[PDB]
Amino acid sequence: FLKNNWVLLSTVAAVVLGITTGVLVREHSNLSTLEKFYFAFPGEILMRMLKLIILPLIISSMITGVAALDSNVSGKIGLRAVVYYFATTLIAVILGIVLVVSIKPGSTVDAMLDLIRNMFPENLVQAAFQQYKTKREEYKIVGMYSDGINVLGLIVFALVFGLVIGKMGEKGQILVDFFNALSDATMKIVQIIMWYMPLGILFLIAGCIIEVEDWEIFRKLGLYMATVLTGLAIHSIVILPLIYFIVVRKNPFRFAMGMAQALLTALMISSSSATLPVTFRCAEENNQVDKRITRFVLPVGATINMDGTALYEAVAAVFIAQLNDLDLGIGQIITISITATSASIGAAGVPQAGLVTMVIVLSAVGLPAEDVTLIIAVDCLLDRFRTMVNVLGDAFGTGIVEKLSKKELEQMDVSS
Amino acid sequence: FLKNNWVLLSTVAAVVLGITTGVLVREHSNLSTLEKFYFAFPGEILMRMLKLIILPLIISSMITGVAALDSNVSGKIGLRAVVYYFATTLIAVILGIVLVVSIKPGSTVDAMLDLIRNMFPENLVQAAFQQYKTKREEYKIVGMYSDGINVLGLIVFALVFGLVIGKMGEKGQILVDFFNALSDATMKIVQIIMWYMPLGILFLIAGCIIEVEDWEIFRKLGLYMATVLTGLAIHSIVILPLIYFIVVRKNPFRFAMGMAQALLTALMISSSSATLPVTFRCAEENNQVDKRITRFVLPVGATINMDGTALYEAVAAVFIAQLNDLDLGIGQIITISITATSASIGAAGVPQAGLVTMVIVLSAVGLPAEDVTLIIAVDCLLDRFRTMVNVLGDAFGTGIVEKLSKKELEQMDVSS
Amino acid sequence: FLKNNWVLLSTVAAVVLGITTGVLVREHSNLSTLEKFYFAFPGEILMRMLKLIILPLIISSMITGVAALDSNVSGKIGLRAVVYYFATTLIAVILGIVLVVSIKPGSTVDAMLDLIRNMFPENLVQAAFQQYKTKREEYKIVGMYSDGINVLGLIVFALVFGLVIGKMGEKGQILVDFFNALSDATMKIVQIIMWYMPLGILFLIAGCIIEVEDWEIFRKLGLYMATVLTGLAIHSIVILPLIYFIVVRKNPFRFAMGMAQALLTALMISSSSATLPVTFRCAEENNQVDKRITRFVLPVGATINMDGTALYEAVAAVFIAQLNDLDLGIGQIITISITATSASIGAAGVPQAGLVTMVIVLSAVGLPAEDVTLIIAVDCLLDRFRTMVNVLGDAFGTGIVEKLSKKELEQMDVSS
Ligand SMILES: [Hg+2]
Ligand SMILES: [Hg+2]
Ligand SMILES: [Hg+2]
Ligand SMILES: [K+]
Ligand SMILES: [K+]
Ligand SMILES: [K+]
């Protein structure tokens, strides 16, 4: 038992040791800023490794999942997945707005058009490391390219390419085999990185509990943390199991239990795209879900799901707006929540989406950007919980989509 | 009939409706600059889609066309194509100079060396989205990289790679199959984009006839438009059919008629590289031209042909020079015409080459860049006609090259 | 005989003619700076061609060499190669320090951490043309990306990818075949460039002996050149042959003689990565070295070897430090030598590594950067000798590693 799953127990022990080391160093030592930065180097190296493997994995896996489906049945499955994700996103948005209004812890047109612009990039190679942005200037619109991987356009192109090569028949079989092999190789490289994972995680946690200086941020942010945690808990325990039970007449909690390893891996590494191998294995072997449904549904959810964004980034934006004593109407609150939810779409995949996404959402909404440092402190913990919620939602969606496509999966088998 | 070719009639109807809508909005409405920009968003989205597909299509198609030819016969075919293109370019240059001198509508060394520098880029990945440029500075030469796809170096590398892998025999067959499948997939994605084409075209035309403000630009630019249109018409109707009849003893106008769909598609979408599927189909099925000659000749012409550049951009440069009352000798006029013709080489492929190429040519020649906005107004129409002329020239060249290589195409068949 | 090896004799004649032309032009002509720059254009074009082919060649060849080895024997061979390179680098460092101290011709933490940071880039596409760098700022650390290919991370990823796909069995065979064909194609393109090589070399040499103005740099740099040349000569003639004779009980000088063509090609083109085809051919056919050992050892040495860096760049750094009359302890001299040796790792592959590496090492050490122009003058000659020394060291290492892995190469054959 210990040898079979030594990675998970070693990671848990590393987390505990990192928390203890961070507390002890903070209490019994006086480190300068430079030494505090040098103390977290292994965690930065681990994050660089994790970011290095996101692109090829997502691209190859998405293409493989699209091409594995028959041409005449892929539309209905995609429609079901889209409907499920839309319903979950809407419910999450409503819950987040209601909670942020009740607890009170405290141009959007260009930002909405930039999403469509980034859906269709002007260069395929440039989209791998750069993104497009526009702003008003004296009024005319001026656009430019800045650093940051454009995963939305890559996803769209991957979907189109997979659909095209899955219909060519024998003319596209070489591409199908090439991308299948590439996906397998990337999955093995991810497994290789998972061996170095725990040592980086230890220093990441130790250095996270070190940068806190005054500790009064915990006093000021108590209600904001309570709001985000309550929203995530309600979404995880009430809404998703009920939807699964409504569609699938089976015990939702047994299904959630069967994905415990994937959930804990997502909670530890704080990334959904890099948890894909564990998610695949748990869904296929523990829950007896069809491979064809899983390999197509999970890659889309690992990059598109926005149930946690609407419950974290939108709540943070509303909290920041409330901090400045700004008077907000019921229409304005909805505007901010939708803008924040839509602005960040690849947050689940990023190992620390919050650090880069907070300033992007604040700039898109048009609020003072100097208040980001107040909320960055608890991002390392709220973001990891959000990652667990997103992975659980993706697994539930995979199960639901498998349940609904019963005749399609039996017609797809008689053909072969 | 209507169902078979619904795309072309729908595109024509969209063009008519866009012209009517633009005229009506300009006459009966007062729109601000921001609203005028927001009115043309679908056209911008269509242009982004068109630009997204240029790179893979050109690269894969060019490699496939080079590799499909036998190693011992590819030299003569390439030589014939080069000679044809050189002759047509020289005739176009002479005609443009003569017309611009007669009607009078009104350092180059670094620019010429930059063409050779861009023929051999220092990085293959960087060449996909960046270009090299040099300038004098106090005198020493300083070079840097700026945005803009370097299609010249990509073409050169594609030619070399295709020639190399077409001679390896069975060792390069996997690469040949891979690039064949990639070319087919890109062609299907282009066909997919052609469905959204008409809706974007409507708003593009409607927003083009909207940005005109004073309407006195039509009074000032009457002679410049007349000169460009007369040059293009003379090249299309007199010179190219005569050359085709001289080499090929067949009716030139029947050959031109058989490519009407491709000509209209080029006139509508204002891009030659994206018209490649229609050109291939019309040349192979309507004119009974050999596939091996077509798949090699057309990709080169869609990126290298300069008969329309010498008749449009050179005429515009000479017009700008005449506007400033600059005294130009017969040597100077030739210098400007050759510099403008050589500076722009990938204009035919770009959906709106004129917008970006005008400032590049003006900077290369060394003339005031503030006069570009005067001529940008009628670019959307002169450029579309230029695109029709270029496509017709490419088709005529394909026919001529097929005619000349008669023994090579019969020796290439006895081998297989 | 003349027809078989016309390239080498033509290159030697071009070198002689270039030296004569440069001397004659310098003595009997007065050229301005702009004309001196325009005189060396063919050499710049040749260097652009050479830089264009480095990336695909190195990546494909390294992957192919890793994947060709059996999974159970690749570790010992890699360990032997690493030990050999470490021993040679240490001996070179010691010799360089001793010589620079005896003859006297006259923060590092961030630079050392940047090496590990660049070992694991955050983006695979961006690593092809950009590098990461950090600096202190008021103290916090700020990082950014600048131009320059990150070959270290590409090498690491190539090693991991080759190891992963060589164990997949039949699931990764398509990738193995693809990269084998790509390596062959790149090797043929290199052979094509070798035809234009001599004409560019002539003008490169002619323009190198032209930029010298005062000729007093030869008087001031006499001892620095003597030190570097003596170190390189001692390393080439004494240490490496002795190590080869100790491990391999065969005549070291016959082995060196059998690689004369590769040595002369490295001396002429001043690049190790582009000399790889000649090195492969000479090692496999003239010295009867196993192909499996050669195709794996040589690509690693052509990018990682640091015996010449420690003998050239470290000596130059110590000379610059001595020029400023800076008092340096025995610990400081070691610090500078190790920092300079470790900072430059891909110098052997670059056609003119010295030009870009001198300022990088000077910035990393923290010394006045205005003294680089004094030592740039003789870089074109010291660098070419360094390239010969590095190629000889790589060949000797290939021989030694082949000798040590005797049972592994006989067990790897009984399996097939
Ligand atoms: Hg934290
Ligand atoms: Hg227009
Ligand atoms: Hg020199
Ligand atoms: K995340
Ligand atoms: K065009
Ligand atoms: K070198």
Side-chain angles (χ1 to χ4, degrees):
Chain A
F1 169 76
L2 301 170
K3 186 255 166 296
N4 180 43
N5 39 75
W6 66 273
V7 175
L8 223 61
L9 294 306
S10 54
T11 286
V12 172
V15 165
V16 175
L17 285 177
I19 293 178
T20 303
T21 304
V23 170
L24 269 206
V25 169
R26 224 194 154 271
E27 186 68 35
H28 295 331
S29 176
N30 207 28
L31 249 64
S32 51
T33 296
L34 220 49
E35 279 144 282
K36 289 188 267 154
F37 179 86
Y38 289 144
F39 191 83
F41 191 69
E44 179 195 355
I45 293 304
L46 172 64
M47 293 287 129
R48 291 181 76 91
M49 273 165 221
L50 283 172
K51 273 181 222 119
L52 178 61
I53 209 57
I54 301 291
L55 177 86
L57 185 67
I58 286 289
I59 280 183
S60 41
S61 291
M62 169 91 242
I63 295 171
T64 285
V66 175
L69 293 171
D70 276 10
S71 296
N72 40 348
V73 313
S74 49
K76 312 161 78 37
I77 296 173
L79 174 76
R80 298 180 220 273
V82 164
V83 169
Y84 168 81
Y85 281 122
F86 165 83
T88 36
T89 298
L90 183 71
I91 297 176
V93 164
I94 293 173
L95 180 61
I97 294 172
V98 158
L99 267 172
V100 85
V101 166
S102 317
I103 301 178
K104 289 173 301 297
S107 55
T108 56
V109 189
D110 291 339
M112 298 302 119
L113 293 188
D114 270 342
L115 278 163
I116 310 171
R117 278 190 190 94
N118 276 304
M119 258 170 240
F120 309 105
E122 267 176 331
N123 201 279
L124 252 175
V125 173
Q126 191 184 24
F129 67 103
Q130 278 198 326
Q131 256 173 319
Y132 193 72
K133 177 160 225 310
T134 57
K135 70 175 174 30
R136 294 180 181 184
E137 154 181 327
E138 256 308 340
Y139 279 129
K140 45 141 182 304
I141 298 288
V142 167
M144 62 170 287
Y145 275 96
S146 57
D147 255 4
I149 172 174
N150 184 21
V151 201
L152 194 49
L154 292 168
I155 288 311
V156 168
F157 190 81
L159 257 294
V160 173
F161 193 77
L163 281 173
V164 158
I165 69 180
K167 205 167 304 188
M168 273 156 77
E170 250 281 330
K171 309 174 127 323
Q173 195 66 54
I174 198 169
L175 302 175
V176 168
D177 298 340
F178 182 88
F179 284 113
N180 225 59
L182 190 60
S183 194
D184 276 326
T186 316
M187 218 83 82
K188 267 150 172 73
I189 299 176
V190 170
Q191 180 181 13
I192 296 172
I193 297 175
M194 281 299 130
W195 291 333
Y196 175 74
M197 203 252 267
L199 205 68
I201 282 300
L202 204 152
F203 285 99
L204 250 170
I205 303 201
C208 183
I209 318 170
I210 272 176
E211 313 205 71
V212 175
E213 298 298 309
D214 285 19
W215 204 76
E216 304 164 358
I217 38 183
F218 287 88
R219 192 79 70 97
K220 311 307 152 143
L221 287 185
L223 286 176
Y224 157 72
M225 292 180 296
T227 300
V228 175
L229 286 180
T230 301
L232 292 167
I234 289 179
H235 202 50
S236 317
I237 311 176
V238 171
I239 297 179
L240 286 178
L242 187 63
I243 290 193
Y244 176 86
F245 181 86
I246 283 180
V247 175
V248 181
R249 311 321 263 261
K250 305 222 253 273
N251 198 293
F253 296 110
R254 207 185 299 320
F255 193 92
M257 185 148 93
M259 310 269 318
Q261 273 210 355
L263 291 174
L264 190 69
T265 304
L267 189 63
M268 291 301 158
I269 82 150
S270 181
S271 183
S272 64
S273 300
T275 315
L276 260 185
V278 194
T279 320
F280 282 148
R281 196 229 308 116
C282 275
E284 283 152 9
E285 271 135 49
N286 286 80
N287 287 322
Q288 261 66 255
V289 190
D290 218 7
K291 191 248 205 64
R292 301 166 281 181
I293 303 294
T294 299
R295 301 281 171 145
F296 166 67
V297 167
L298 284 182
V300 188
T303 326
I304 286 326
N305 194 357
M306 294 160 282
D307 320 333
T309 288
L311 279 169
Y312 175 41
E313 268 86 346
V315 177
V318 179
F319 167 66
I320 293 302
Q322 287 189 329
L323 273 190
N324 308 312
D325 294 347
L326 249 59
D327 199 18
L328 308 150
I330 203 47
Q332 307 183 19
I333 295 199
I334 294 161
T335 305
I336 323 178
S337 76
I338 299 183
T339 300
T341 305
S342 295
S344 45
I345 308 188
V350 181
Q352 297 287 172
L355 309 179
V356 299
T357 49
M358 278 318 162
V359 317
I360 289 180
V361 175
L362 282 165
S363 300
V365 179
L367 281 176
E370 47 84 32
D371 218 336
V372 64
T373 64
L374 178 56
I375 69 187
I376 297 263
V378 295
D379 170 61
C380 38
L381 176 83
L382 297 177
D383 189 19
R384 279 177 163 86
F385 290 119
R386 198 254 304 274
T387 308
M388 193 219 78
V389 175
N390 280 11
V391 162
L392 187 64
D394 297 334
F396 273 138
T398 298
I400 283 158
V401 172
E402 192 222 19
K403 167 71 161 54
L404 290 178
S405 300
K406 183 213 235 283
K407 139 186 183 211
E408 262 76 54
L409 289 174
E410 95 176 40
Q411 142 180 6
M412 225 182 92
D413 257 314
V414 85
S415 72
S416 74
Chain B
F1 169 76
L2 301 170
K3 186 256 166 296
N4 180 43
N5 39 75
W6 66 273
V7 175
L8 223 61
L9 294 306
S10 54
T11 286
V12 172
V15 165
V16 175
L17 285 177
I19 293 178
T20 303
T21 304
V23 170
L24 269 206
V25 169
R26 224 194 154 271
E27 186 68 35
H28 295 331
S29 176
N30 207 28
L31 249 64
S32 51
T33 296
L34 220 49
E35 279 144 282
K36 289 188 267 154
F37 179 86
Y38 289 144
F39 191 83
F41 191 69
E44 179 195 355
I45 293 304
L46 172 64
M47 293 287 129
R48 291 181 76 91
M49 273 165 221
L50 283 172
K51 273 181 222 119
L52 178 61
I53 209 57
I54 301 291
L55 177 86
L57 185 67
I58 286 289
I59 280 183
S60 41
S61 291
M62 169 91 242
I63 295 171
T64 285
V66 175
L69 293 171
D70 276 10
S71 296
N72 40 348
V73 313
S74 49
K76 312 161 78 37
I77 296 173
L79 174 76
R80 298 180 220 273
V82 164
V83 169
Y84 168 81
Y85 281 122
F86 165 82
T88 36
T89 298
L90 183 71
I91 297 176
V93 164
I94 293 173
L95 180 61
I97 294 172
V98 158
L99 267 172
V100 85
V101 166
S102 317
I103 301 178
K104 289 173 301 297
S107 55
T108 56
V109 189
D110 291 339
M112 298 302 119
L113 292 188
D114 270 342
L115 278 163
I116 310 171
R117 278 190 190 94
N118 276 304
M119 258 170 240
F120 309 105
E122 267 176 331
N123 201 279
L124 252 175
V125 173
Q126 191 184 24
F129 67 103
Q130 278 198 325
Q131 256 173 319
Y132 193 72
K133 177 160 225 309
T134 57
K135 70 175 174 30
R136 294 180 181 184
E137 154 181 327
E138 256 308 340
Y139 279 129
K140 45 141 182 304
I141 298 288
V142 167
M144 62 170 287
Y145 275 96
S146 57
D147 255 4
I149 172 174
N150 184 21
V151 201
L152 194 49
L154 292 168
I155 288 311
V156 168
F157 191 81
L159 257 294
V160 173
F161 193 77
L163 281 173
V164 158
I165 69 180
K167 205 167 304 188
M168 273 156 77
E170 250 281 330
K171 309 174 127 323
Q173 195 66 55
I174 198 169
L175 302 175
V176 168
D177 298 340
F178 182 88
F179 284 113
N180 225 59
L182 190 60
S183 194
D184 276 326
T186 316
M187 218 83 82
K188 267 150 172 73
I189 299 176
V190 170
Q191 180 181 13
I192 297 172
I193 297 175
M194 281 299 130
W195 291 333
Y196 175 74
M197 203 252 267
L199 205 69
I201 282 300
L202 204 152
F203 285 99
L204 250 170
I205 303 201
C208 183
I209 318 170
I210 272 176
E211 313 205 71
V212 175
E213 298 298 309
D214 285 19
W215 204 76
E216 304 164 358
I217 39 183
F218 287 88
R219 192 79 70 97
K220 311 307 152 143
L221 287 185
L223 286 176
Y224 157 72
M225 292 180 296
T227 301
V228 175
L229 286 180
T230 301
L232 292 167
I234 289 179
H235 202 50
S236 317
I237 311 176
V238 171
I239 297 179
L240 286 178
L242 187 63
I243 290 193
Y244 176 86
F245 181 86
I246 283 180
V247 175
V248 181
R249 311 321 263 261
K250 305 222 253 273
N251 198 293
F253 296 110
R254 207 185 299 320
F255 193 92
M257 185 148 93
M259 310 269 318
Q261 273 210 355
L263 291 174
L264 190 69
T265 304
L267 189 63
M268 291 301 158
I269 82 150
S270 181
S271 183
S272 64
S273 300
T275 315
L276 260 185
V278 194
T279 320
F280 282 148
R281 196 229 308 116
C282 275
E284 283 152 9
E285 271 135 49
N286 286 80
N287 287 322
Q288 261 66 255
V289 190
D290 218 7
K291 191 248 205 64
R292 301 166 281 181
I293 303 294
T294 299
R295 302 281 171 145
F296 166 67
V297 167
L298 284 182
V300 188
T303 326
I304 286 326
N305 194 357
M306 294 160 282
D307 320 333
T309 288
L311 279 169
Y312 175 41
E313 268 86 346
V315 177
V318 179
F319 167 66
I320 293 302
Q322 287 189 329
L323 273 190
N324 308 312
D325 294 347
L326 249 59
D327 199 18
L328 308 150
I330 203 47
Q332 307 183 19
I333 295 199
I334 294 161
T335 305
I336 323 178
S337 76
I338 299 183
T339 300
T341 305
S342 295
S344 45
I345 308 188
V350 181
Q352 297 287 172
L355 309 179
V356 299
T357 49
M358 278 318 162
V359 317
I360 289 180
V361 175
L362 282 165
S363 300
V365 179
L367 281 176
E370 46 84 32
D371 218 336
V372 64
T373 64
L374 178 56
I375 68 187
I376 297 263
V378 295
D379 170 62
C380 38
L381 176 83
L382 297 177
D383 189 19
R384 279 177 163 86
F385 290 119
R386 198 254 304 274
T387 308
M388 193 219 78
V389 175
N390 280 11
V391 162
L392 187 64
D394 297 334
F396 273 138
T398 298
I400 283 158
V401 172
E402 192 222 19
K403 166 71 161 54
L404 290 178
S405 300
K406 183 213 235 283
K407 139 186 183 211
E408 262 76 54
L409 289 174
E410 95 176 39
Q411 142 180 6
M412 225 182 92
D413 257 314
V414 85
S415 72
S416 74
Chain C
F1 169 76
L2 301 170
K3 186 256 166 296
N4 180 43
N5 39 75
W6 66 273
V7 175
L8 223 61
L9 294 306
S10 54
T11 286
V12 172
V15 165
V16 175
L17 285 177
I19 293 178
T20 303
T21 304
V23 170
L24 269 206
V25 169
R26 224 194 154 271
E27 186 68 35
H28 295 331
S29 176
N30 207 28
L31 249 64
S32 51
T33 296
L34 220 49
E35 279 144 282
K36 289 188 267 154
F37 179 86
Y38 289 144
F39 191 83
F41 191 69
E44 179 195 355
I45 293 304
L46 172 64
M47 293 287 129
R48 291 181 76 91
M49 273 165 221
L50 283 172
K51 273 181 222 119
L52 178 61
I53 209 57
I54 301 291
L55 177 86
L57 185 67
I58 286 289
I59 280 183
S60 41
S61 291
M62 169 91 242
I63 295 171
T64 285
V66 175
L69 293 171
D70 276 10
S71 296
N72 40 348
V73 313
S74 49
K76 312 161 78 37
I77 296 173
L79 174 76
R80 298 180 220 273
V82 164
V83 169
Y84 168 81
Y85 281 122
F86 165 83
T88 36
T89 298
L90 183 71
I91 297 176
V93 164
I94 293 173
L95 180 61
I97 294 172
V98 158
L99 267 172
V100 85
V101 166
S102 317
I103 301 178
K104 289 173 301 297
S107 55
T108 56
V109 189
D110 291 339
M112 298 302 119
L113 292 188
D114 270 342
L115 278 163
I116 310 171
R117 278 190 190 94
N118 276 304
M119 258 170 240
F120 309 105
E122 267 176 331
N123 201 279
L124 252 175
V125 173
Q126 191 184 24
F129 67 103
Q130 278 198 326
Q131 256 173 319
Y132 193 72
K133 177 160 225 310
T134 57
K135 70 175 174 30
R136 294 180 181 184
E137 154 181 327
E138 256 308 340
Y139 279 129
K140 45 141 182 304
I141 298 288
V142 167
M144 62 170 287
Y145 275 96
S146 57
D147 255 4
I149 172 174
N150 184 21
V151 201
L152 194 49
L154 292 168
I155 288 311
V156 168
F157 190 81
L159 257 294
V160 173
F161 193 77
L163 281 173
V164 158
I165 69 180
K167 205 167 304 188
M168 273 156 77
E170 250 281 330
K171 309 174 127 323
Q173 195 66 54
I174 198 169
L175 302 175
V176 168
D177 298 340
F178 182 88
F179 284 113
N180 225 59
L182 190 60
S183 194
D184 276 326
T186 316
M187 218 83 82
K188 267 150 172 73
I189 299 176
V190 170
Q191 180 181 13
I192 296 172
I193 297 175
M194 281 299 130
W195 291 333
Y196 175 74
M197 203 252 267
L199 205 69
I201 282 300
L202 204 152
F203 285 99
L204 250 170
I205 303 201
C208 183
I209 318 170
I210 272 176
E211 313 205 71
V212 175
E213 298 298 309
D214 285 19
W215 204 76
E216 304 164 358
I217 39 183
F218 287 88
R219 192 79 70 97
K220 311 307 152 143
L221 287 185
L223 286 176
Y224 157 72
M225 292 180 296
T227 300
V228 175
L229 286 180
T230 301
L232 292 167
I234 289 179
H235 202 50
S236 317
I237 311 176
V238 171
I239 297 179
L240 286 178
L242 187 63
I243 290 193
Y244 176 86
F245 181 86
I246 283 180
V247 175
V248 181
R249 311 321 263 261
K250 305 222 253 273
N251 198 293
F253 296 110
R254 207 185 299 320
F255 193 92
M257 185 148 93
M259 310 269 318
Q261 273 210 355
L263 291 174
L264 190 69
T265 304
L267 189 63
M268 291 301 158
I269 82 150
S270 181
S271 183
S272 64
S273 300
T275 315
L276 260 185
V278 194
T279 320
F280 282 148
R281 196 229 308 116
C282 275
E284 283 152 9
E285 271 135 49
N286 286 80
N287 287 322
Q288 261 66 255
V289 190
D290 218 7
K291 191 248 205 64
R292 301 166 281 181
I293 303 294
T294 299
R295 302 281 171 145
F296 166 67
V297 167
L298 284 182
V300 188
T303 326
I304 286 326
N305 194 357
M306 294 160 282
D307 320 333
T309 288
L311 279 169
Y312 175 41
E313 268 86 346
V315 177
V318 179
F319 167 66
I320 293 302
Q322 287 189 329
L323 273 190
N324 309 312
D325 294 347
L326 249 59
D327 199 18
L328 308 150
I330 203 47
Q332 307 183 19
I333 295 199
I334 294 161
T335 305
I336 323 178
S337 76
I338 299 183
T339 300
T341 305
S342 295
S344 45
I345 308 188
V350 181
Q352 297 287 172
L355 309 178
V356 299
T357 49
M358 278 318 162
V359 317
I360 289 180
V361 175
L362 282 165
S363 300
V365 179
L367 281 176
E370 46 84 32
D371 218 336
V372 64
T373 64
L374 178 56
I375 68 187
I376 297 263
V378 295
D379 170 62
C380 38
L381 176 83
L382 297 177
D383 189 19
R384 279 177 163 86
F385 290 119
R386 198 254 304 274
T387 308
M388 193 219 78
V389 175
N390 280 11
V391 162
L392 187 64
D394 297 334
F396 273 138
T398 298
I400 283 158
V401 172
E402 192 222 19
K403 166 71 161 54
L404 290 178
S405 300
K406 183 213 235 283
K407 139 186 183 211
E408 262 76 54
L409 289 174
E410 95 176 40
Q411 142 180 6
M412 225 182 92
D413 257 314
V414 85
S415 72
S416 74

